[PDB]
Design a protein around this ligand. Structure first.
Ligand SMILES: *[C@@H]1O[C@H](CO)[C@@H](O[C@@H]2O[C@H](CO)[C@@H](O[C@@H]3O[C@H](CO)[C@@H](O)[C@H](O[C@H]4O[C@H](CO)[C@@H](O)[C@H](O)[C@@H]4O)[C@@H]3O)[C@H](O)[C@H]2NC(C)=O)[C@H](O)[C@H]1NC(C)=O
Ligand SMILES: *[C@@H]1O[C@H](CO)[C@@H](O[C@@H]2O[C@H](CO)[C@@H](O)[C@H](O)[C@H]2NC(C)=O)[C@H](O[C@H]2O[C@@H](C)[C@@H](O)[C@@H](O)[C@@H]2O)[C@H]1NC(C)=O
Ligand SMILES: *[C@@H]1O[C@H](CO)[C@@H](O)[C@H](O)[C@H]1NC(C)=O
Ligand SMILES: *[C@@H]1O[C@H](CO)[C@@H](O)[C@H](O)[C@H]1NC(C)=O
Ligand SMILES: *[C@@H]1O[C@H](CO)[C@@H](O)[C@H](O)[C@H]1NC(C)=O
Ligand SMILES: *[C@@H]1O[C@H](CO)[C@@H](O)[C@H](O)[C@H]1NC(C)=O
Ligand SMILES: *[C@@H]1O[C@H](CO)[C@@H](O)[C@H](O)[C@H]1NC(C)=O
Ligand SMILES: *[C@@H]1O[C@H](CO)[C@@H](O)[C@H](O)[C@H]1NC(C)=O
Ligand SMILES: *[C@@H]1O[C@H](CO)[C@@H](O)[C@H](O)[C@H]1NC(C)=O
Ligand SMILES: *[C@@H]1O[C@H](CO)[C@@H](O)[C@H](O)[C@H]1NC(C)=O
Lengths: 171, 326, 324, 175, 323, 171
């Protein structure tokens, strides 16, 4: 994908993470488990919901009757009416088909970007207190208990608190 | 010594929904929504909370002229569109042309008010002419010769058809739809036997309408056993305005007229699809559509506030992500 | 330590735009794609003023309804303007044949010259060209008639066969209009034309039609139980048009040499005319814009932006505006 | 946003930087200041200008009179004309509304990308000689006067020139 | 040290495309979406050749103008071609009623056969069917007339009422055409038809019209001060058409059994017809493309790309080319 | 520009890599040369092919005859027919033009992303066993023979195999 995360450096999805689109798996001495990142998930939901509603609600037509009746000496205008109906048909069909194709690529890129960004937000907090081991995973150079893990997830990881322990293990 | 770990990842689930993207077909995603309405209720429904006028085995011509076969139909004082069936062929039982028929049909398509009234009462309007003998095998009713209910085929009384003059002032407060016919006999004999006078005219006028009719006597190919023809005309009399009829023969005179108020932009559905006590905002000939979706592939010819018709079979929009379970 | 930060502009902008993921995003810079204002004037199109018909409509104007005599008519115009209250038209009731087609034909004209096709003073030695006036067509309270036509009437007790030809020597198309009169009664017929059973024939190289008066009482419009039908045709340069009649002919007096240009239309509006130029005119005002869309009016004349239902089409150019 | 910078790791904008869309704030002993990156800014201005002009100018209509007049017996072609007008209306409205929604998102993504690319170009230069302290800022492990600052901005920062001073401070800071 | 570099293809392509941010970007590969080529021929559509009318228009061809005799008419055609100088039509001046409708009806035909609906030798025992020629319709300099109509004239001093019927047993629609003659004078009326006051009536189950001659001197066209109007109707299978007249009727001689197909049209062009097939025909040549857009001509027949004012629609497939 | 690689941190293209859109240049003791990454290239070819085919094939017009003939007294409907042909012309011309402009930008973005992702995949494997020397190049802190080079292109580079040797030269 465009942003290299989904089906990219993070090779697969998690059926085990049921409560959101993006998030975390942690493993420390007090246990392990999946947890959705609710904020990035909710932003994405709000965004996509807005997208679907825009695609839907921007179409607001007036009350109209498409049918027309012409007698056997009005074939030219009957054919004209047909040209109008057929013309609209070709436009709406082409535009609807392409719109879906193009916006689907964009929707998928968007999720890829959200995942990429989530990963970068963690990488940036942890710096060298953890090791990037691939597949979207970090291995800590220090014990990271639930309080620590929670702090990573809400962007308040305290790097200096753990830097000494991490340094020792890293060297 | 293996350290604690934190992994970043994304949802997968059991969804088998696929979507197409500009780069790749049939991508399985975790969530998606359809943009294409492909479902209808197989019913002809009320539009704007008003039922359609269903003509049964009659077409609009049979209905508005009062073809004997249409007398059984119920006509509400209003309707949101009109339904004929593909086999509805009870129309002009006496052969001829219905002038500006498609225009009348468009005008009658929706109506907010519609009241029949005896414009020229049969029992009092024609003391100098015969208003009972104008029946024909071409328009049978209970196997007996009959005629359109809304028109009277005036005929000579005794051996005299004196000049006829008749007027109506529209005191209805709304448009009055008036219909009449002009009879064109097969032969000069038929002309005499019906109207006595050999050389006749009909004249019809309002502030707006004005036309003189001259019967064109000739043998046309038999249709419904008739070698003659009858042409049908209509006009809309403005409130306050007057319509006059003048004739020395060959005038199929109005009996009933219609005070009405036409209603905006509707149409006529021709279909066997049954009517039903259902409400809709979008009606197609094969069923009503109830959706907020922008596109539909049910039918190009719709009436109402409708989704745009497309040739597509599938307009699926991804909402979730690429679904990649273990 | 010393620092270097990367960043982006913020400013005082309160412009919002909608995006596919989010509504009302405040951005630093934006441009409107929607033209939503007009100048409240009816302007010149192609640098040519419209023909304004004041309280007359095209029928009244082209026939020379006495109430339209005061209108000025240029030799060219880019479109036609009527007012919604303009109904001085056919003051004698009847049908104007292919009226809408004529209106469209006349909507824009690069050249237009009224001329006396059949001079009143010399053309009709055997008929009366003065008595053809009517209370239905008053001029200053006096009975009158259309300026461009003459209602020929019997001279004494005689209406001899009329025959009169005109050859188009204007080097351009000539619009000829005439009327056919349908009296209310046989009495009226005799009183006007003497002959009881009359016809009118009009013929050119491309037009040919015989008319038969239809005598009957119509409901009174403008006090008249009779009717007058109005007809028109375009005689090509060099072609002849011929009039033949034994009664009931409202003959041309003035006709019109013209050169039709492309296709404009007719604006019906109370909006006042003005000495301004425009390239896109709506019924309620001209619009000057390079913008691709407009919500002023769907019915426009000229090279115009597409009409849309939108109220706001604001394209972002700058970035999300996030001050302090 | 899509590239993570604007309203992302770079939390807000600078009202103080008036001379352009993207740029720099430095602070050393000789003082502090804002300065737009003129090249990235101008590329974006040209790009967006081309985008605006494309949207506008690709619409090149011909002289037309939309109105039609029909008489009372031409209701059907009148309605046909109306179908045409309303059909064009539904098409243009929908396409214009979506064009704007979609392209506005793309425009904001574009800005986000430019800010991200600018950030990464600095990161690439400085590497080890500076600490990424988040919010788009780099804190130098060495003294960076105006000349030095200016060198980073025009892409000629001399990493080996300062690496030794940086190495010492960095390792000292990290005990 | 040993190195590994990541890079991307460059080449000697000069192809440019426009993008939303930048015009004229040079790319390594691209494809055109716009068809701007045609073969300059008028080809067979749906594998069926068009009917080419030469110097005749449809009115001349369908009435049988003497100058249209040498034209060949297939029993089917996909569309019709006239040239901009095709002026042999109604040689005797007058109006062709619902002529545009007829052209539209005849534009494409899956089956078309001329037959003699009213044989010249046996149909008119009480009328003269051999004097109906005119200098308005010369053939080889001699006075002639339309092939498919007969201009009946009085026989001796008499034009009795004519009544002639035809029942359509062709199993398909029959196109019947006829004329009404409008003489310049009373004298001309009498010389041709004897009877001063005449009518023509044509009727079917569907059609019913009475025509009255209008006698007057019109300005001369092709030396005629009179006029002839032309009419047509389509007789449904099993239906009867009846002609009745006391004068002034130009009767059908040949009529046309036909089966119309779908929606084609008429091309007016000097472009030569050629033995080639196409799926998309323009007046200036045929288009063979899969592309969705074309700038050849707005007026096309077939399964054609959408006409656009575009001069260039180049789609990037490759990369920005930076060699 | 969108992804920072093409005409970005990788300044120009390679006329010497003729067998593909993206790829590699290596120099080691046993040789040097260009080689396209066939997989990343093929994916892009398949993606772009699908894209072209979509823009082309979603337009499926029916058999129609555009022309109409009107007489001198049918000017109003002739102009209605003209408004139809011209309305369609405007829609299609505008839509085709924007479609091309917009998608060309997306195609170029796409290539940029593919190059960026290719570069990132190498960077993530090599880590500090090589030096990012800009312009999309890595200088190995260890001998990298053809087997090693191939492991890098393959996404299976063995960091710990070379980490001692690398750390020595990197000091
Ligand atoms: C990207 O490429 C396009 C395609 O070429 C390019 O658009 C072109 O711009 C040039 C401007 O140099 C246009 O050339 C002019 O077009 C008008 C229209 O007919 C002519 O009248 C002009 O002739 C006069 O002007 C000349 C320039 O001063 C004079 O030297 C000359 O004597 C005449 O007085 C002139 O030819 C050209 O029409 C367009 N091309 C198309 C296909 O429209 C665009 O500028 C390029 N953009 C970038 C950023 O490179
Ligand atoms: C994905 O897996 C879940 C969990 O098994 C499925 O929901 C289960 O559906 C069964 C009915 O077959 C129901 O008895 C379980 O209670 C329900 N489990 C949960 C946790 O909700 C789900 O399939 C189904 O989901 C339910 C809610 C029902 O609407 C059914 O129609 C639907 O198919 C699986 N999804 C798919 C697409 O297979
Ligand atoms: C339809 O709507 C009307 C109100 O207009 C209501 O009275 C009626 O009960 C509704 N019927 C159904 C089936 O929704
Ligand atoms: C009604 O239709 C039936 C079937 O088409 C027909 O046989 C019958 O004669 C019609 N009756 C009238 C009065 O038109
Ligand atoms: C906002 O700032 C601009 C300078 O960029 C200034 O010119 C403009 O007038 C300001 N708007 C208001 C309302 O002060
Ligand atoms: C309008 O333009 C014409 C030429 O197109 C010019 O002669 C005239 O002076 C202009 N008038 C105004 C008011 O701009
Ligand atoms: C014109 O003025 C009003 C508007 O119709 C009307 O009352 C009057 O009779 C008209 N006069 C003529 C001559 O048309
Ligand atoms: C590119 O190279 C090929 C190699 O044969 C050559 O044929 C062609 O002329 C070149 N194209 C250009 C744009 O010069
Ligand atoms: C055929 O056309 C030529 C000129 O194109 C004309 O001179 C000739 O009289 C025409 N013949 C007929 C029979 O229409
Ligand atoms: C199309 O034309 C070719 C030659 O131009 C011919 O061989 C072939 O029979 C035609 N195809 C069909 C199906 O008629």
């Amino acid at each position: 994908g465009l942003f290299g995360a989904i089906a990219g450096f993070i090779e697969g999805g998690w059926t085990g993470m049921v409560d959101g689109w993006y998030g975390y798996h942690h493993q420390n001495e007090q246990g392990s488990g999946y947890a959705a990142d609710l904020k990035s998930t909710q932003n994405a939901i709000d965004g996509i919901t807005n997208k679907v509603n825009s695609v839907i609600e921007k179409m607001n037509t007036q009350f109209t009757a498409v049918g027309k009746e012409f007698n056997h000496l009005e074939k030219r205008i009957e054919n004209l009416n047909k040209k109008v109906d057929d013309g609209f048909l070709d436009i709406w069909t082409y535009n609807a088909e392409l719109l879906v194709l193009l916006e689907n690529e964009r929707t998928l890129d968007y999720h890829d970007s959200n995942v990429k960004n989530l990963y970068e937000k963690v990488r940036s907090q942890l710096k060298n207190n953890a090791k990037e081991i691939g597949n979207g995973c970090f291995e800590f150079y220090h014990k990271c208990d639930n309080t620590c893990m929670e702090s990573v997830k809400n962007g308040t990881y305290d790097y200096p608190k753990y830097s000494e322990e991490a340094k020792l293990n890293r060297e | 010594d293996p350290g604690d770990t934190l992994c970043i990842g994304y949802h997968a689930n059991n969804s088998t929904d696929t979507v197409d993207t500009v780069l790749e077909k049939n991508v399985t995603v975790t969530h998606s929504v359809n943009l294409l309405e492909d479902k209808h209720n197989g019913k002809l429904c009320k539009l704007r909370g008003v039922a359609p006028l269903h003509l049964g085995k009659c077409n609009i011509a049979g209905w508005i002229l009062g073809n004997p076969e249409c007398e059984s139909l119920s006509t509400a004082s209003s309707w949101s569109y009109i339904v004929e069936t593909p086999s509805s062929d009870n129309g002009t039982c006496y052969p001829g042309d219905f002038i500006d028929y498609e225009e009348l049909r468009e005008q009658l398509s929706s109506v907010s008010s519609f009241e029949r009234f005896e414009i020229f009462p049969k029992t009092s309007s024609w003391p100098n002419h015969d208003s009972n003998k104008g029946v024909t095998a071409a328009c049978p009713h209970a196997g007996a010769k009959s005629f359109y209910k809304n028109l009277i085929w005036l005929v000579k009384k005794g051996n005299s058809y004196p000049k006829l003059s008749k007027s109506y002032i529209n005191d209805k407060g709304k448009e009055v739809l008036v219909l009449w016919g002009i009879h064109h006999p097969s032969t000069s004999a038929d002309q005499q036997s019906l109207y006595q006078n050999a050389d006749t005219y009909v004249f019809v006028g309002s502030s707006r309408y004005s036309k003189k009719f001259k019967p064109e006597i000739a043998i046309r190919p038999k249709v419904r056993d008739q070698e003659g023809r009858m042409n049908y005309y209509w006009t809309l009399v403005e409130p306050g305005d007057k319509i006059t009829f003048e004739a020395t023969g060959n005038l199929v005179v109005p009996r009933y007229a219609f005070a009405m108020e036409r209603n905006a932009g509707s149409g006529i559905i021709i279909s066997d699809t049954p009517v039903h006590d259902c409400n809709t905002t979008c009606q197609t000939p094969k069923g009503a559509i109830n959706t907020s979706l922008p596109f539909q592939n049910i039918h190009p010819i719709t009436i109402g506030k409708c989704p745009k018709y497309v040739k597509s079979t599938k307009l699926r929009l991804a909402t979730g992500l690429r679904n990649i379970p273990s």
